[PDB]
Ligand binder design. Structure first.
Ligand code: CA
Ligand code: CA
Length: 296
DNA sequence: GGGTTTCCACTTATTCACCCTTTTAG
DNA sequence: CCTAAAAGGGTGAATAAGTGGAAACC
């Protein structure tokens, strides 16, 4: 752990990458036949381990471990430590549908705080809570509690609270790219800066507000077969240079994605100076693109 | 102790990120 | 003609969520 993370940036990053967990596990050693585990977790690629360590030192809770060969995770399940998680998301609330999952996390916390999870009465309530959380109930767990159990919950419809949140959220779902377009120009290569944010259609309302909230961009309806998601995209350079860049200069990104923004800004300064029309500039832009994003 | 909590190892599905070329605008 | 802007996408893997196993605590 090194530095601390702004609380609203943390909530925005949690809106993007965090997830709440509730385990209801068969257990022959448990008086009620089941044991439980409640908490919150973030799984990232190895290269962003510094974010996990910064979150850990901000909250002073959580356990960092490997998550396969290429990922690393921060998990909070120590029950007393979950109070920190509750206190944070009460002061700095989530604004995506994940708020719904967090609200269920809170109900489960109340049950385990009353120690009711050690009685069949509490287990049954935890099953009702888990039925509306994330993937919901497995077929086995559903058959183990025959009663009628609702799986539906209230949709979340909230607004971007501030740029600090947007910087956290963008550090997760954002991308700063450079399109090399084969154009009918003299150089034969048009340089195009592209900024975009991706999100499932379950939060269409939040995605469309980005247009209004940022004063630029458009929405693209995408789908890979049976799956749908949205993509907010800005390609006009004046918007990128006047509206997108300054927002993130003043609300600093986190993770390696910050380096991608810094490099993205160099290309922006080149364009701004028209150096992107000279061949020496084009070669500098190619060098930058090669060493950012995957190429880094 | 023994029932309960906490942690580490590891997997799985799809929502992301990040990429491309072609077409149209101005 | 010329450059910027948008359109129209392709797709692998970093995410979100998850289970198995057990040391260890109260
Ligand atoms: Ca997400
Ligand atoms: Ca991410």
């Amino acid at each position: 752990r090194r530095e601390s993370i702004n609380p609203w940036i943390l909530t925005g990053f949690a809106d993007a990458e965090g997830s709440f967990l509730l385990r209801i596990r068969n257990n022959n050693k448990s008086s009620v036949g089941y044991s439980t585990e409640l908490g919150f977790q973030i799984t990232l690629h190895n290269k962003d381990k510094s974010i996990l360590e910064n979150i850990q030192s901000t909250w002073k809770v959580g356990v960092i471990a490997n998550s396969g060969d290429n990922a690393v995770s921060l998990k909070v399940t120590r029950f007393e430590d979950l109070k920190v998680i509750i206190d944070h998301f009460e002061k700095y609330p989530l604004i995506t549908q994940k708020l719904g999952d967090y609200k269920l996390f809170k109900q489960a916390f109340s049950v385990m705080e009353n120690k009711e999870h050690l009685k069949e009465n509490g287990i049954k309530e935890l099953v009702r809570i888990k039925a509306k959380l994330n993937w919901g109930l497995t077929d086995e767990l559903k058959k183990a509690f025959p009663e009628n159990i609702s799986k539906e919950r209230s949709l979340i419809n909230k607004n971007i609270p501030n740029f600090k949140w947007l910087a956290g959220f963008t550090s997760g779902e954002g991308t700063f790219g450079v399109n090399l377009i084969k154009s009918k120009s003299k150089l034969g290569v048009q340089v195009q800066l592209r900024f975009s944010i991706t999100q499932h259609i379950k939060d269409k309302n939040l995605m469309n507000s980005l247009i209004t909230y940022l004063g630029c961009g458009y929405i693209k309806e995408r789908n890979k077969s049976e799956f749908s998601w949205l993509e907010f995209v800005v390609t006009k350079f004046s918007d990128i240079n006047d509206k997108i860049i300054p927002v993130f200069q003043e609300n600093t990104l986190i993770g390696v994605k910050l380096e991608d923004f810094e490099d993205w800004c160099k290309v922006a300064k080149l364009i701004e100076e028209k150096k992107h029309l000279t061949e020496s500039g084009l070669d500098e832009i190619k060098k930058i693109k090669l060493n950012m994003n995957k190429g880094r």
